[PDB]
Design an enzyme around this catalytic site. Sequence first.
Site, PDB file in Angstrom:
ATOM      1  N   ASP A 431      20.912  32.577  -6.808  1.00  0.00           N
ATOM      2  CA  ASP A 431      21.699  31.336  -6.719  1.00  0.00           C
ATOM      3  C   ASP A 431      23.128  31.661  -7.197  1.00  0.00           C
ATOM      4  OD1 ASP A 431      21.530  28.295  -6.349  1.00  0.00           O
ATOM      5  OD2 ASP A 431      22.315  28.408  -8.397  1.00  0.00           O
ATOM      6  N   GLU A 464      37.273  37.728 -10.326  1.00  0.00           N
ATOM      7  CA  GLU A 464      36.603  38.117  -9.086  1.00  0.00           C
ATOM      8  C   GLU A 464      35.910  39.487  -9.133  1.00  0.00           C
ATOM      9  OE1 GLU A 464      39.701  39.700  -8.970  1.00  0.00           O
ATOM     10  OE2 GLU A 464      40.996  38.031  -9.556  1.00  0.00           O
ATOM     11  N   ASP A 498      19.945  31.182  -1.101  1.00  0.00           N
ATOM     12  CA  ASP A 498      20.200  29.807  -0.672  1.00  0.00           C
ATOM     13  C   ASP A 498      20.961  29.582   0.642  1.00  0.00           C
ATOM     14  OD1 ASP A 498      19.899  28.460  -3.972  1.00  0.00           O
ATOM     15  OD2 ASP A 498      18.949  27.585  -2.180  1.00  0.00           O
ATOM     16  N   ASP A 612      18.295  28.163  -9.687  1.00  0.00           N
ATOM     17  CA  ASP A 612      19.278  27.106  -9.842  1.00  0.00           C
ATOM     18  C   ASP A 612      19.292  26.509 -11.240  1.00  0.00           C
ATOM     19  OD1 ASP A 612      20.193  25.723  -6.632  1.00  0.00           O
ATOM     20  OD2 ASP A 612      19.250  27.687  -7.018  1.00  0.00           O
ATOM     21  N   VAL A 637      14.243  26.157 -18.412  1.00  0.00           N
ATOM     22  CA  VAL A 637      13.476  25.097 -17.776  1.00  0.00           C
ATOM     23  C   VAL A 637      13.486  23.763 -18.531  1.00  0.00           C
ATOM     24  CG1 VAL A 637      12.027  26.807 -16.745  1.00  0.00           C
ATOM     25  CG2 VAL A 637      11.348  25.772 -18.890  1.00  0.00           C
TER      26      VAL A 637
HETATM   27 MG    MG Z   1      12.997  21.371 -19.940  1.00  0.00          MG
END
Ligand code: MG
Length: 637
Positions: A431, A464, A498, A612, A637
Amino acid sequence: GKTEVFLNRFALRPLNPEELRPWRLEVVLDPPPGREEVYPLLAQVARRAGGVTVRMGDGLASWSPPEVLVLEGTLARMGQTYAYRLYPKGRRPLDPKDPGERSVLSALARRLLQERLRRLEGVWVEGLAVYRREHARGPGWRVLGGAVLDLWVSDSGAFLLEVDPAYRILCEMSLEAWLAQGHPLPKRVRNAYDRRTWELLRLGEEDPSLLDYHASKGRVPVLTLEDLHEALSLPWEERRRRTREIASWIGRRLGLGTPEAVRAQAYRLSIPKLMGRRAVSKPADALRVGFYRAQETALALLRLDGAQGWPEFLRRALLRAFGASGASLRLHTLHAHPSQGLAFREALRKAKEEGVQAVLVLTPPMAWEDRNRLKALLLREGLPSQILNVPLREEERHRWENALLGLLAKAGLQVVALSGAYPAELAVGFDAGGRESFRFGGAACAVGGGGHLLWTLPEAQAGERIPQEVVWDLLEETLWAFRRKAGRLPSRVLLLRDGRVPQDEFALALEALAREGIAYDLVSVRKSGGGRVYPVQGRLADGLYVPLEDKTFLLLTVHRDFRGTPRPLKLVHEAGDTPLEALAHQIFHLTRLYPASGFAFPRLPAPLHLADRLVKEVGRLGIRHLKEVDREKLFFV
DNA sequence: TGAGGTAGTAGT
RNA sequence: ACUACCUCG
Ligand SMILES: [Mg+2]
């Protein structure tokens, strides 16, 4: 499991010889635009010109007689005001076969559709959207429903009509009136003369000529999240129903023939064999059954409210899990408060020294920025954390059970693993840190096996860097992590990206996997744009694989309620010699490996899904060298 | 911060 | 990306 289905695509008439060879105009601008503003201008010129004209190359192609188009004039962009001219360099043939050209034809198709809606009597139009009925109403507000439309050109020189039911919210009140009753602000507002959405700062406590101005000519806020609750979505049969209608109604006034729904053969992929210590239908079940592989653990509790120890059901819950689970754990209770300064920090030090793998924070809802601070803090000390808002009753079963699943994953516990044989032993997803390419970094997560998953973060900087190197670096790090955690480098990897960002950005990345003598399949996932999939007979199953054109396909990973319609992902096999079913089958199976939910799998495959969240989290917190943490601890998470 | 899905929002 | 609508033995 071979079923047949309809796609919300409708086949129409084959493009005649004039449509295949649109006129070709040259464009002369004064003064010279500049490398990166030229394309925007040409597009902005195609609009000024009028007719069915789109930008083709550095000049535009058209379908309207060059005579009817406005050949000269002026336009303004980002300050500058330019003068344009057009010189008709004849008709140039386009080949639908050639994807590049097939794009110039398709564009004109949208312009054509957009010009026909423009002239529709009694119908609300917004872009390519058309609302032909009133679905709702109420106090000076109402919902109009219709369909977002699209018209592109086939790979075989034919027309294609896309239809998809949609709703539109419209304010019946005026700027004042709205403000009147007692409504807060509106981000966008559009004149009552021309629909020009606008960003209003606030009411101008100014003057009273401003009035004469409008008076001379003879002469409302756009809404979004300003609606009291008295259901925006549609169930598949109803939106399959509204599709057919809207399509038959629109096609019935485009003069390109009867739209003919495009059927396609689907397939019902095999159900995933999700496993904890014993079979399990949803990760939550691992708590009662026992995890797949479970290391001992040591968790710390951080109460930011008034209370003291572990709420009993939580102590139990865990103790019952590790119980059926192989090993057993050891709880801990941090006796310090974030304000205690060095005291608190030194506390985390002992916590991590004494074994603790992850902290569980019990606290009243935390203001966005306080939340990010505590997490970054605990994180630097190398401790992932799970927040569980304090007002907590033990019947809020679902909520604290997710907190636990997170805690555990944050501790590095393999909740559930996939039972079975798959083509790639390692599936890694990427991602991007800069939306359009990995030029400004990015992140990546992978899932293997044993069955263990991990995360990777780009080699520090800011500034970059050749995309491809950034990308190979991501894969390179991921491979390493997989060795020091399994001992063996995979023989076949599955790369998931993606799709937005180009492709050759993975070139050098593949070059290396080549030299390093390791197999691979590169697949691109697009969350939107896969239209819809409706069966012709029967019900809408879950786990449907529908092959489209050459190497691209649609997968339907979920269907979890009957009050909405599922959104299939579109996938394109851009590298590798693995059969599409093997892929579809593996991608559809990697959907049950996300450990943080436990009551419902996510639409995307876990490798991309985790990618992501790892990126958004890397941005929300301020991670540079969060490298004190073990790469199997899913702290994000 | 429990998390997932589908939706909408993304000249005066 | 943000917000709402649900929903989750
Ligand atoms: Mg959580």
